[PDB]
Design brief:
Belongs to the HisA/HisF family. The chain has about 230 residues and is of the alpha/beta class. It has eleven helices and eleven strands. The chain has an eight-stranded parallel β-barrel, surrounded by five helices. The longest helix has 11 residues. The termini are close together.
Length: about 230
């Protein structure tokens, strides 16, 4: 499926380029129109909460989830068990765990045990290094942490990992997704980044990728969610 995405900071829809462009304070109508076009899942990044978990945009997130009829996965500053629980209580379908999944795997394994694998998405940034290894990093501006995508996935398979979001931070690579999806067919991989036009979606068909996250291309009016879904399903 196509997974339309918004980044939110203080109620504002923004485009990440780190440069930020204002696309207005209307996230709910935007999300509603994404769902209206057939989206089965939506993705939100709470950039305010990522900067300071104390300022997690829970009231806004509550409104947004209430305002659509499809599950929303939400990330941004998910550091503690309490963070996960707060988002779920707000009505979020899945909590996106990013840096903490790299930093404290034994702790996050406990979260799988408490919340269940259907409630959690592990978001991993990947750099392909000179050797061709898929190196995990916690962000685009930090060095690699010294664990491969495969090694980290295999860390969480024993607690029933089901959802992994993989962003290539090294138009959009296809080989990356083909490889990992084939190796772990019991995991539903999502791809993020590199979607600049409709042909980029077509390119990911047949790779085995389950979900294609699309953010900026929808904001920039390159194509619609309906067109993305039509291309994805054909």
């Amino acid at each position: 499926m196509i997974i339309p995405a918004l980044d939110l900071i203080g109620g504002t829809v923004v485009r990440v380029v780190a440069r930020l462009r204002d696309y207005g304070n209307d996230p709910l109508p935007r999300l509603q129109d994404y769902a209206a076009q057939g989206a089965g899942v939506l993705h939100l990044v709470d950039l305010t909460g990522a900067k300071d978990p104390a300022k997690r945009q829970i009231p806004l997130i509550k409104t947004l989830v209430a305002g659509v009829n499809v599950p929303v996965q939400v990330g941004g500053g998910v550091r503690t068990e309490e963070d996960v629980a707060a988002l779920l209580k707000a009505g979020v379908a899945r909590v996106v765990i990013a840096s903490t999944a790299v930093k404290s795997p034994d702790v996050v394994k406990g979260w799988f045990e408490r919340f269940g694998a259907q409630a959690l998405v592990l978001a991993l940034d990947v750099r392909i290094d000179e050797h061709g290894t898929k190196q995990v990093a916690v962000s685009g501006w930090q060095e690699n942490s010294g664990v491969s995508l495969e090694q980290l996935v295999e860390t969480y398979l024993p607690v029933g990992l089901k959802h992994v979001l993989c962003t290539d931070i090294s138009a959009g690579n296809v080989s990356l997704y083909e490889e990992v999806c084939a190796r772990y067919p019991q995991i539903a991989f999502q791809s993020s980044g590199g979607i600049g036009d409709i042909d980029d979606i077509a390119a990911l068909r047949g790779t085995g990728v389950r979900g294609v996250i699309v953010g900026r291309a929808l904001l920039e009016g390159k194509f619609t969610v309906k067109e993305a879904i039509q291309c994805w399903q054909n």
